[PDB]
């Protein structure tokens, strides 16, 4: 019943969340020629690890969906959840917040580091 790789790309963001594993899998799997193949293999690894580097820092590693403690800023978007989840593709959404992607990432990283600092302190008090 799978839509296949990127088959969800035209779907709404809410519907697309069903297929996250389809995209997550095959990120690693899918003489003049010999060197080009080697470059392709190294590049695919760097690509995969780039996203994993961010997830490990965010504490989101090992999860397809990761909730955070960073509040949404209305300046990033003023849309209601129905306007986003039931009326947009992820392709459209990425364009809407393309200028804020790095800003959001830094805020997530800051929140994770403070959270772990606090978790340690809570354990130290026990």
């Amino acid at each position: 019943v799978s839509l296949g790789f990127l088959g969800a790309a035209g779907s709404t963001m809410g519907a697309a969340s069903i297929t996250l594993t389809v995209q997550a899998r095959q990120l690693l799997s899918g003489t003049h020629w010999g060197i080009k193949q080697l470059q392709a293999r190294v590049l695919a690894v760097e690509h995969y690890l780039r996203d994993q580097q961010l997830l490990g820092i965010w504490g989101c590693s090992g999860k397809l969906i990761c909730c955070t403690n960073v509040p949404w800023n209305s300046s990033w978007s003023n849309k209601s959840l129905d306007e986003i989840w039931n009326n947009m593709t992820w392709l459209q959404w990425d364009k809407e917040i393309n200028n804020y992607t790095q800003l959001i990432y830094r805020l997530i990283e800051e929140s994770q580091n403070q959270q772990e600092k606090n978790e340690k302190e809570l354990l130290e008090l026990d």
Epitope: T12, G14, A15, D82, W85, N86, N87, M88
Partner: nanobody, 130 residues
Framework: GQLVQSGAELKKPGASVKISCKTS????????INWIRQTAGRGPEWMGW????????????????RVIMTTDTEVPVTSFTSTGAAYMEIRNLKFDDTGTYFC????????????????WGQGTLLTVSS
């Protein structure tokens, strides 16, 4: 998004009429096209709706034998917008059918309320006389 409709015209009783609904500024296939009628003696009433994506339609019981809905194939403008048109045909017109006819755009691509008529065209008058 914007919707426009065929201009008002006079018909004889029993005559057929066809009303176009040209659209722009949004993807035509992403949303339902609704048709809604208003008359002085009835108020607003649904004629049902059609989905350009599947071609499926839901006609209200009152109109099932007299109303036919069709759509044109969409023509893209941008990767996220297109143009196209819906058409509705009414057969066996009566004086009771006189009033304003509206074309309207569906609300959402998903969720419980996808077909609601979020955007409306200006609407045009249909008149019947012998």
């Amino acid at each position: 998004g914007q919707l426009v409709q065929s201009g008002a015209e006079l018909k004889k009783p029993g005559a057929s009429v066809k009303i176009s609904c040209k659209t722009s500024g949004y993807r035509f296939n992403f949303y339902h096209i609704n048709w809604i009628r208003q008359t002085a003696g009835r108020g607003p009433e649904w004629m049902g709706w059609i989905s350009p994506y599947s071609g499926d339609k839901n006609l209200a019981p009152a109109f099932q034998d007299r109303v036919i809905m069709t759509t044109d194939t969409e023509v893209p403008v941008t990767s996220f917008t297109s143009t196209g048109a819906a058409y509705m045909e009414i057969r066996n017109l009566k004086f009771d059918d006189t009033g304003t006819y509206f074309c309207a755009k569906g609300l959402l691509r998903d969720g419980s309320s996808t077909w609601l008529p979020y955007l409306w065209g200006q609407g045009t008058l249909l008149t019947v006389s012998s």
